[PDB]
Design a protein around this nucleic acid. Structure first.
Lengths: 333, 107, 240, 335, 336, 108
DNA sequence: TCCC
DNA sequence: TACAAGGGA
C-alpha cells in the first residue's frame, strides 16, 4: 500500500489536498483505496504507485485547463478561475500556476518552487501574520506547487459553492464536506456527484442566496445524488466571501453539520415531489422569514418553528398540501 | 387517529374559499400552556360551525363536516392525563399544523 | 515524586494557533499556556527574586525555573472529561498592529472560542521541598485566566495525589511518542512559549455525533503502567 | 482592592451584541453552542451570549466617565474623551493628554503616571514594547445552565421588523412604493437569566508591572510611582465604574432597546492580596463551589471579606447581607 | 441634568405598534417573550409589547412640538417640522433648515449648533460618516410580571374585525370586476398593566461628542457651542416633551384606538451627574430595589432628588410626593 | 362519570339543525361561566327549554331528546359544591360546553 | 505606483 | 441597507 502521507498545514487546506488525492487517483485507477481521517491529517491508503497518480493528476488538470480555455491573460468564469477567486489578480494567477504544474508534469519532472495560497482554499490564511509585535511584509504562508494544484482540483471537482451578485458587491458561499471516520471510493464519488459546475446564479428574484444556510438549503433541494450519510457520519465546513465596496473579507465561519438537514428533507419528500419541490421553492422565495424559521427548526428541533414557517408560507402564496403536513407530523414523532 | 377530521375542520377556517379568515382561534390554540386555554381555544374554533355551514351551502360546495361526537370524547379522555405541558406541546402544535393543510373542500 | 492536579471550571478558552483573521483555537490547551499560568502564579506570590525589571525577562526566567523543575519539557497534561465544542463570534478586534493605516481604523474581524464544562490539568514535579511545595500549592490556584483575557478560568480544586503505580487506560494527554508504540489525532501545540520547540502531540479525544455538533469525548487509548485515582475513578498517565 | 464578583442577572427584551447585522436588512444576535445534560445525554443548544470585550468597553466608558468628576482627571488621553482606546500603534509614539500635553512612551512609569486609562486597562507600544495587560478581566455573559435545562425548547428569540420613514416633499411616501414603507430592517431580541463574572485586580493600580516593589531599604513596600492620593482616587473611580454596569448600561441599541435589567443574585469577595476567581454564573451548582473555595482559602489563611445578595452562601461564613450592588461598592470603597 | 423615570401605567384596548404585515389583512400586534417565576422553574411567556423605537419617535415628536414655540425654533431641521425621523439618510450630504437655509454635514459642531433634533436625539450620516449618540433612551412597554403570573395567560388580546363601506355613486355594492373596496380587515387590541423606564442625559446637550472640553484656563470647561439660553430652552423643551408622553401619545392608530392611560405609580430621580439607571417597573419587587438604590446612593455621597407618585418608598428619606407627571416635570424644570 | 356526555347531548339540541331553535345565548353563557352560580343559572336556562324541544321532536318526526336524568342533576350539583377553584371550574365549564357543537345524528 |  | 475597513500581483 502506498499509504501516501499528507502535509499538515490547515484542516481545511489539508482536507482539500488529501481529498483531491482521490480524484487524482480515480482517473488513473487505484482501486480498493480508503481515506482515514486524523482530525486534520486526513491520511490516505492506496495500492497505487507514483506514476499512475501523476497520470491521473495530469488528466484531471488537463480537463481543468480544457474547461478554462473554453471561456476568456485569459480570465474565464470558472470555479477555479473567477467563480471562487475573490481577488482579480488570482483570476489570471491560478490558471498560470495550473499550466506551469502541467508543463513540469508531463516531462516527468518534479516541482522546484512554492506559491502563495489564496484565502479561497483556506480561510485560515491571509496576507499578514502576527509574529511578536507586528506583521510581515508580503504573505508569510506559502505551499508547494503540486499540493496547491491538487487541492485546487479537489475543490473544483467536489466542493459545492454558490455565488450571488446583487450589483457591485458579491456573496460567495463555499462549503466543504468532511468525513471523520472512514470512506471508500463509492462514497467519495457520491460526494463528487454533489458538485455542480457554473453556479453563477445572479438574478434578482433569487435574492435569498444571502443567509448562507438558506442558500445551501436551496442547493440541497435540487441535489439528489444519494442519501449516503444516513449511515455514515459527515460534517460540513462553510465560509463566506464578500465584495462590499471592493473590500474582500470573510465574515462567517459557523460550523454545524449537514446530515440531519438533508435527512429531514429526504423523510420530508416520500409522499410526492410535485407538491414538495415547489413547496420548498415557494416558501424560500415568498416567505424568507418563514424559510428562516423552518431552517432554524430543522437545525435545533423546536416544534414552533414548523408552525411559524407553515403560517408564513400560507399567508402569502403557499398551498401547503396535506401529504407534506402528514410527513412533517411523522417527522415530529 | 381522529386528527385528520379536526384538521379539516380547522382548515375550513383558513382556506381562501371561506372569506372570513379566523386566524385568532388557530393562533391561540397553537400557543397553549395547559388544559384550560387550549380547551377554550378549541371551543371557540368549533363555535364557528354554523357560519361555515351556511357559507358553504350558499356558495354551492358541499358543507363542512363537523367532527363526530364519537371522537369528541377522545380529546378529553386523552388530555386530562397530560399533566406535563411538554408532551402536550406536540399535540398542540400537531393540530395547528394540520389546520394549515390544503384540504380541498369546494372544487 | 509528586504531581499536582488542579481542575479548572471555565466558560471558554481562546488560545489559538498561528493564524490570520480567524485565530484557530487549540483543541486542547497548550503546554506553554499551562506553564505560563503557574509562572504568573509564582511571580505574583513571591516577587522577592522571581520578579525582575523586565516583565518579559521575569516571566521567561520563571518559565526556565519551572521547566527545570519539570521532569521533562513535555510534562503537563490535560483531561477532556467534559465535552469540547467550538463556537464562532464576530468581534470588533481592531487590527491596528499592521504597519500603517493610522490608528482610527476599524476592521470588524471574527474569532472562535472553545466551550467546555471543566478540565483537569496535571503538573508533574520532582522531589520538591516543602518550603517551596506550599508556595507551589498556593500558586496552583489563582489561575484566573487561560490564554485570551476574556477566557476566565476558575480552579475549584487542587491537590497533590501520588500515582501509586496504578494500571488504567490512558486518559490524560501525552505527546505522540508512546501512542505510536501502542480515531488517532495529531497536533502541534508549541511546547514552550515563543520569545525573541514544536513536537507531534497525540490528542485523546474522539468523535461521537449524537447531536448537531459532533464534539468530542473519550477515545480510551490502551492501558498504561501509570495511573492516578480521583474520587474513585482511575485515569491513565505517562511520564518519561 | 482585589475584588471578584459572580452571580446571576435577569434581563430581557434586548438586542445586545448584534452578530454583525446582516446584508438583507436582517440583524441577528451572537449565538453560542452550549452542552447540557438531558437525562443521560450530552445535548447541545443555541443561546445568546454577550462577549467579554463588550463588557470591557463598557467598563472603560464608566471608568472614564467617573474619572472626569475628580480633580485628578486631567491625566487622561484625548482618545478616552471620545470613547476611543485603540491605544496607539506602530505609527504613534507620543501621547496627547486632554489639554494636548506631549507624553513620551519609553517607560511604563511615566505612561501610567500621565495617563489613567492606560494604567487600569493597559496599553500597547509596539515600538518599545512595554506591554501592560488590563487589570480588569470580564468573562462572557452566558445564560445559566439550569434555566436552559428546564426550558430546553422554545426559541426565546423574537425577530421584529422596524421601518424608517422618509416621506416626499409634500405628503407622498416617495416613489419607492409601499411594499416597504421606505425601508424594513429586522432586529432580534433575546430573553433569559444570565450569569456573569468580573475580576478587578485594583491592587496593582499605579504600580508599574516591571517594578512591583523597589526594595532599597530592605522592605518590600509597594513601588507606587504615582501620588498615593490620586491613586486612591483612581481606585474609587474604578470601583464606581461598576455601578453603571449592573443597572442597564451594557450592550448596544440603548436608544431603542435599553434592556429591562435587574440583578437576581450575586456573591463577591474582597481582599488586599491576590485571590482566585470564584466561578462563572453559567453553572447551576456555583454556590457550593463558592463555599468550597472560600473554605479552602480561609483554611490556607487568606483574609477574605464576603458579600452576598439574594443568596445565603452557607451560615458559618461571616457573610454580609447586601441589598444592591451600589451598597456593595459603598462597602468596598471603605478600604 | 440627568434624570431617570420608572413606573407602571395602566392600559386597556390598545392597538399600538403592530406588525401590520403577514399578507394583506389581519393586522396582528407585536409580541415579545419574557421570563417569569410562576412558583416553579423559570418559564417563558408570550405577551404584547411596544418597541422602544416608537417611544423614541414619539419623544422626538413631543420635543419638536414643545420646541417650535421657543424663540430658538428656527434652528431646526426641515424634516423635523414634518415629524420625519429620516435623520441624514443615504446619499445626501446636506440638510435643509426650517427657514430654507442649508447646512453641510461635515463637522458635528455646526450640525448640533444649527440643528436641534440632531442634538438631543443624535444622528448618523453614512456619507460623511458622522455619528452622534442619542441623549434619550427608552425601554420596551412590557406588562408587569406579577400581572402576567396572576392572569395565567388568557392571551391578553382580542381580535376585532370591521369593514369599509366603499360604495359606488349609483348606490350599489359592485363586485370585484366593477371595482369596490368593500372589504373586511381585523385588528388586535391588547390590555393590561404595563411597566416602563426612560432615561435622559440632558447634561451633554449642546456639547460635541468629539471635544467635550476645551481647556483654556486649565480646567475642564464644557465645550458649549451654543448660547446658554438656547441650551436651557432645549433642555426645558426636552423635559416638557414628557407632558404629552404619559397622556395617550405613545401609540399608533390614535384616530381609531387612542389608548386609555392612567399612570398608577412611578418614581423619578434627578442628580445632575452620573447616575445608575433605575429598576424597570416590569419586575414586581422594583419598589424596594429603587428605594435601596436611592437611599444608599444618597448615603454614598451623591445629591439625588427623588419624586414619587403612589409609592410608599421607605418614608425615612427626603422624597417629594408628586401627584402628576406634568407636576413632576414642573418640579424638574423649576430646578434647572 | 358519564353524565357529561348526557348533558352535552341535551345541550346539542339547542344549536343543531332540523330544529329552528338556535339559542347560542345560553350555550355561550354556560361556556364563559366565570363563577359557579352563573354556571348553574345557565344550566337552568338550558333545561327550561326542555318541553318545547321534547314536544317539537315528536311534532317533526324525530326521536325524543335525551333529557338528563335526576342522577345527572345530582352529580352536577355535588360537583359544583366541592369545586370552589375557578381554575377547575373553567375547564369543567368548557368541558360541558364543548359537546354542544358536534355531528350528532338527532334525526335519522 | 497597478488592480478592482 | 445605506459607509467605511482589502486582498493581492
Amino acid at each position: 500500500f502506498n499509504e501516501f502521507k499528507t502535509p499538515q498545514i490547515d484542516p481545511i487546506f489539508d482536507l482539500y489536498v488529501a481529498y483531491g488525492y482521490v480524484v487524482s487517483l480515480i482517473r488513473g485507477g487505484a482501486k480498493e483505496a480508503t481515506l482515514i481521517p486524523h482530525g486534520a491529517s486526513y491520511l490516505i491508503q492506496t495500492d497505487v504507485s507514483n506514476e499512475e497518480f501523476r497520470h491521473g493528476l495530469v488528466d484531471a488538470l488537463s480537463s481543468m485547463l480544457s474547461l478554462h480555455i473554453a471561456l476568456a491573460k485569459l480570465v474565464s468564469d470558472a470555479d477555479f478561475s473567477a467563480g471562487a477567486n475573490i481577488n482579480n489578480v488570482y483570476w489570471d494567477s491560478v490558471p498560470r500556476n495550473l499550466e506551469k504544474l502541467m508543463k513540469d508534469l508531463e516531462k516527468k519532472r518534479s516541482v522546484k518552487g512554492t506559491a502563495t495560497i489564496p484565502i479561497t482554499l483556506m480561510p485560515s490564511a491571509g496576507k499578514y501574520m502576527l509574529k511578536h509585535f507586528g506583521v510581515q511584509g508580503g504573505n508569510p504562508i506559502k505551499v508547494d506547487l503540486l499540493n496547491y494544484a491538487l487541492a485546487w482540483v479537489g475543490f473544483h471537482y467536489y466542493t459545492p459553492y454558490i455565488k450571488y451578485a446583487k450589483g457591485d458587491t458579491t456573496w460567495i458561499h463555499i462549503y466543504q464536506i468532511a468525513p471523520v471516520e472512514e470512506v471508500d471510493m463509492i462514497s467519495i464519488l457520491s460526494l463528487k456527484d454533489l458538485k455542480m459546475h457554473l453556479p453563477h446564479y445572479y438574478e434578482s428574484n433569487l435574492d435569498f442566496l444571502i443567509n448562507r444556510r438558506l442558500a445551501l438549503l436551496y442547493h440541497l433541494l435540487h441535489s439528489e445524488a444519494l442519501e449516503l450519510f444516513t449511515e455514515k457520519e459527515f460534517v460540513i465546513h462553510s465560509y463566506t466571501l464578500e465584495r462590499s465596496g471592493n473590500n474582500q473579507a470573510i465574515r462567517s465561519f459557523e460550523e454545524e453539520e449537514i446530515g440531519k438537514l438533508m435527512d429531514f428533507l429526504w423523510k420530508l419528500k416520500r409522499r410526492d415531489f410535485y407538491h414538495a419541490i415547489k413547496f420548498i421553492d415557494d416558501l424560500l422565495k415568498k416567505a424568507t422569514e418563514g424559510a428562516l424559521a423552518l431552517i432554524d427548526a430543522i437545525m435545533n428541533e423546536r416544534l414552533e418553528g414548523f408552525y411559524t414557517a407553515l403560517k408564513l408560507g400560507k399567508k402569502a402564496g403557499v398551498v401547503s398540501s396535506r401529504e407534506i403536513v402528514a410527513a412533517l407530523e411523522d417527522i415530529i414523532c | 387517529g381522529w386528527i385528520r377530521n379536526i384538521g379539516r375542520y380547522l382548515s375550513y377556517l383558513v382556506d381562501d374559499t371561506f372569506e372570513e379568515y379566523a386566524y385568532d382561534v388557530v393562533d391561540g390554540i397553537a400557543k397553549a400552556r395547559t388544559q384550560e386555554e387550549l380547551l377554550e381555544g378549541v371551543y371557540k374554533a368549533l363555535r364557528l360551525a354554523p357560519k361555515l355551514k351556511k357559507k358553504a351551502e350558499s356558495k354551492g360546495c358541499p358543507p363542512p363536516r363537523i367532527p363526530s361526537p364519537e371522537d369528541i370524547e377522545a380529546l378529553e379522555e386523552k388530555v386530562e392525563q397530560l399533566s406535563n405541558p411538554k408532551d402536550l406541546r406536540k399535540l398542540a402544535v400537531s393540530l395547528a399544523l394540520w389546520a394549515f393543510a390544503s384540504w380541498n373542500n369546494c372544487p | 515524586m509528586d504531581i499536582l492536579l488542579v481542575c479548572l471550571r471555565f466558560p471558554f478558552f481562546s488560545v489559538a494557533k498561528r493564524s490570520y483573521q480567524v485565530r484557530t483555537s487549540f483543541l486542547l490547551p497548550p503546554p506553554s499556556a499551562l506553564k505560563g499560568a503557574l509562572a504568573k502564579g509564582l511571580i505574583l506570590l513571591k516577587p522577592e527574586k522571581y520578579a525582575s525589571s523586565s516583565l518579559d525577562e521575569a516571566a521567561l526566567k520563571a518559565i526556565k525555573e519551572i521547566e527545570s523543575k519539570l521532569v521533562d519539557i513535555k510534562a503537563v497534561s490535560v483531561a477532556p472529561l467534559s465535552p469540547l465544542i467550538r463556537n464562532a463570534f464576530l468581534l470588533k478586534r481592531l487590527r491596528n498592529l499592521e504597519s500603517g493605516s493610522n490608528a482610527e481604523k476599524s476592521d470588524a474581524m471574527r474569532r472562535e472560542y472553545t466551550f467546555t464544562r471543566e478540565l483537569l490539568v496535571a503538573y508533574i514535579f520532582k522531589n520538591l521541598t516543602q518550603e517551596e511545595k506550599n508556595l507551589y500549592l498556593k500558586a496552583a490556584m489563582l489561575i484566573d485566566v487561560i490564554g485570551d483575557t476574556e477566557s476566565l478560568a476558575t480552579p475549584v480544586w487542587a491537590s497533590f495525589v501520588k500515582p501509586e503505580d496504578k494500571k488504567a487506560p490512558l486518559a490524560f494527554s501525552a505527546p505522540y511518542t508512546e501512542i505510536y508504540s501502542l480515531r488517532m489525532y495529531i497536533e502541534k501545540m508549541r511546547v514552550s512559549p515563543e520569545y525573541s520547540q514544536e513536537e507531534i502531540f497525540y490528542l485523546p479525544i474522539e468523535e461521537r455525533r449524537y447531536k448537531r455538533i459532533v464534539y468530542y469525548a473519550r477515545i480510551y487509548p490502551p492501558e498504561v503502567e501509570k495511573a492516578l485515582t480521583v474520587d474513585g475513578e482511575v485515569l491513565g498517565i505517562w511520564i518519561p | 482592592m482585589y475584588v471578584r464578583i459572580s452571580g446571576r442577572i435577569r434581563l430581557n427584551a434586548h438586542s445586545l451584541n448584534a452578530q454583525g447585522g446582516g446584508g438583507t436588512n436582517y440583524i441577528e444576535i451572537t449565538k453560542t453552542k452550549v452542552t447540557v445534560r438531558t437525562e443521560n445525554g450530552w445535548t447541545v443548544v443555541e443561546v445568546p451570549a454577550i462577549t467579554g470585550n463588550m463588557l470591557k468597553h463598557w467598563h472603560f466608558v464608566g471608568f472614564v466617565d467617573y474619572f472626569k468628576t475628580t480633580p485628578y482627571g486631567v491625566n487622561l488621553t484625548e482618545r478616552a474623551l471620545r470613547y476611543n482606546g485603540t491605544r496607539f500603534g506602530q505609527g504613534e509614539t507620543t501621547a496627547t493628554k486632554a489639554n494636548g500635553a506631549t507624553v513620551q512612551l519609553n517607560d511604563e512609569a511615566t505612561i501610567i503616571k500621565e495617563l489613567a486609562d492606560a494604567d487600569v486597562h493597559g496599553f500597547l507600544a509596539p515600538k518599545t514594547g512595554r506591554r501592560r495587560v488590563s487589570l480588569v478581566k470580564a468573562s462572557f455573559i452566558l445564560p445559566t445552565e439550569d434555566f436552559i435545562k428546564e426550558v430546553e425548547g422554545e426559541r426565546l428569540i423574537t425577530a421584529i421588523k422596524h421601518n424608517r420613514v422618509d416621506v416626499d416633499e409634500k405628503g407622498a411616501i416617495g416613489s419607492s412604493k409601499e411594499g416597504t414603507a421606505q425601508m424594513l430592517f429586522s432586529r432580534e431580541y433575546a430573553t433569559g437569566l444570565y450569569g456573569f463574572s468580573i475580576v478587578l485586580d485594583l491592587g496593582l493600580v499605579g504600580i508599574p508591572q516591571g517594578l512591583p516593589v523597589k526594595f532599597e531599604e530592605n522592605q518590600p513596600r509597594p513601588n507606587i510611582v504615582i501620588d498615593p492620593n490620586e491613586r486612591k482616587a483612581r481606585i474609587e473611580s474604578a470601583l464606581k465604574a461598576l455601578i453603571p454596569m449592573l443597572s442597564g448600561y451594557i450592550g448596544a441599541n440603548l436608544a431603542r432597546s435599553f434592556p429591562v435589567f435587574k440583578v437576581e443574585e450575586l456573591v463577591a469577595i474582597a481582599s488586599e492580596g491576590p485571590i482566585p476567581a470564584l466561578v462563572h454564573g453559567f453553572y447551576e451548582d456555583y454556590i457550593e463551589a463558592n463555599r468550597s473555595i472560600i473554605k479552602n482559602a480561609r483554611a490556607l489563611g487568606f483574609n477574605i471579606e464576603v458579600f452576598t445578595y439574594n443568596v445565603d452562601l452557607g451560615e458559618d461564613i461571616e457573610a454580609t447581607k447586601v441589598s444592591s450592588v451600589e451598597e456593595l461598592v459603598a462597602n468596598l470603597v471603605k478600604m
